[PDB]
């Protein structure tokens, strides 16, 4: 209701302000441009108000020219400054205060003086004119009661225009009225998860009623909503209400769980908003109610859709915070909020993200930069001294203090004026980096991780995995190529990101590789849901991960809360056959539905299954000859041979759905040397506060490497060896009253044991 | 049919403009706006009546195409 | 000046103006967070949540302290810190309805 | 004051918590005679965690005992 209320005089003011900016060479129309164009229309009520104040056009021209400011400008996209749009909101709000359905020049001047920060605000202040003085100056110059007792009308509020414009629900507003204009099942029920904005549908429909967009069949109907919290005595109230509604004939009820005959007789057109689970439990079983309701699904708007919604509200927020918001800031905000926050859906979570981002930059750039605080202290201390001098009858001394204090106050105004003039010079735009800061605090993820552009990260995935995993480069190359194909779009979007099977010796790096992949891709090491088939052996185990069946009291809950995670299925070779049926569905369909009807997603997950089969086949190749192995064969050749064993125990249909098969090699003496090298670096950073560097000789590293050397158990004993050897001695040094403080400790095997050379850094 | 829409909008803005004149005691312009609004409503009635009159000229009937959608 | 709110509710910004009570020290993040929330446009009404005994009531003193220090921005300027007392609260709802009329009109 | 509040011995308060761990082996064998392997293993584990080698969030002690 903006264009429909601005009078012709008000419209000419905006046109005048546009050409004022052209003359002054400004690429953005500021508040001062409104004042210049205002004086060029001496016919409105505002012109009379300033006339009684003896304020002429030329006097304010030079007044604003004192601090007008000049600079370069770019033709095109001549928008309004963030403060200018706040003036329009203020002026329109003041119109409703006086109960006026139109906005004219008399309100433009009223709102200009209420800005209190703009250029025009200071001009009026310099002429001893405030909001109160001009407020009174223009004043002189100028039914179903029982239903309404426990309900609330909506279209009346929408008439006021205070409601924000609901966008993106056009496909559903038309859908609801489509259901209403039917002889049967003319009672639509909105079905969806709570908080997705189901209540916002009613506001959108009421807005269309006020805007005269619904057809005549849906014209002039009172939109009414009843709160669930308003409830023998209860039964008496509803009977009186329904009779009144039948008499009115145009009251649309809105509910959210007696009344069954009312709907059976076509007396009510209620629009429920209950959840899907309650709908299937309390309504589906009732055949009579089922024939009188048409469920309508309410879904979260898409990412691209949210961009348009935020752009519509962008102007409204630019006024409240007086902060310029760029287009690129909005698109980054919605994408990142959806990427990490997965608890409130769009757009109700992206709106608050940009709300805090604007407020955060507002506070930082508003406080005085220690330029007026210093002067304020100087003024304060002189005043207290002068007051004490009066009690001491030091009239001569107080005279000097008066001059000093007056000078301090004189400079205080000068510093404040120049500080705010510089502030008005630039635009306090919002950058996507500021948004990244707020979300980084919400999750603890490092700002560097969030700031990654996701492009070079995928290209350098091979190097990143080698940082935390040493050896078995063939596995790294295959998985890195697989994931980069899926993200490039070569795979079906509904299918998960990847599916893999891990084989080889147990405890060789199968678990560590999965942790490394989760950290590199999803930016978190603990972003993994480890699932073991130890508890899944019987047929009833399938009723555990999918959730308790109806009439009774897991995996779906966890994945839903963390849509970006790596799922591990250990002991897949030992599991109930019915569980395998679920797995095949996930790989192809890409989503599952629990007993409650809610659908989880798997398009942002990587599935990895660990199987113990084939490992004995690999070690048979190692023991085929006394002193020989088959490591020199081609990697694909080994993959083909191991595939024969894999299909022997599993179903070939399941294997064809798997993206790739990964087989891990063994470990050699030289490889184990580098394994301890990583752990030494990790432990060095562990006690980073002490700043102690530990260097271990090659002989000592080899001595401890062979101590834990066990091909049957892999590299598992290696970690325990370091714990009982280096950690035990190092800890005792610290326990002895900080024996080493920022020093350097070298460990060298002298032949008998590890010689702990104690020295300094 | 995209005709009574804009015509109704003009009636709305004219009514607001007349209200501004009344509150500003600009009765000279208000008198002109009052006559202008009557002109808008006079053609509004004729435009609406001819539209619904032509609506009865044709009969809207279903087809398998509509059900297919 | 909301005369009814002054009687049925306790006013704390006056006490902070006099500075009789000890200043709140150590709650730097809590105070900076509350002012940030109040500067927002939507859901700008923070609620203090904590265990009973961490002195959440004393935390509200720090917010009024910044007003007396004139450290809060212009948006928070001229806002009286009024706290409702449960001792004063059909007849129960008469008092709250009477006070809320003045609060909405004042707007500060 | 604290000693008279919960009955904590004054000697324990005077301890700097730097030599109690050093004498943990002697104290444990005072009440548990024998089974030296079960005593030395846990004595050398608490020092590592308290020094800061282990993750601070995770609990210092986590063991499972076997036997009658
Ligand atoms: N960078 C690395 N390269 C190779 N192996 C590693 C690396 N880091 C850790 N490991 C090994 O990976 C093993 C993971 O064991 P895990 O797979 O959990 O055993 P299991 O398969 O029995 O569950 C650890 O014992 C560790 O020795």
Numbering used by the authors:
A (entry chain I): 1 to 142, 159 to 247, 255 to 279, 281, 299 to 594, 601 to 808
B (entry chain J): 410 to 478
C (entry chain H): 159 to 247, 255 to 273
D (entry chain H): 479 to 546
Share the article's original sentences:
The AAA+ protein ClpC and the peptidase ClpP form a major bacterial proteasome with crucial functions in bacterial stress resistance and virulence. ClpC forms a hexameric ring and threads substrates under ATP consumption through its central channel into the proteolytic chamber of associated ClpP for degradation. ClpC is usually repressed in an inactive resting state, where two ClpC spirals interact via coiled-coil M-domains. Antibacterial peptides and partner proteins trigger ClpC activation by binding to its N-terminal domain (NTD). This study reveals that the NTD stabilizes the resting state through multiple anchoring points to M-domains and ATPase domains.
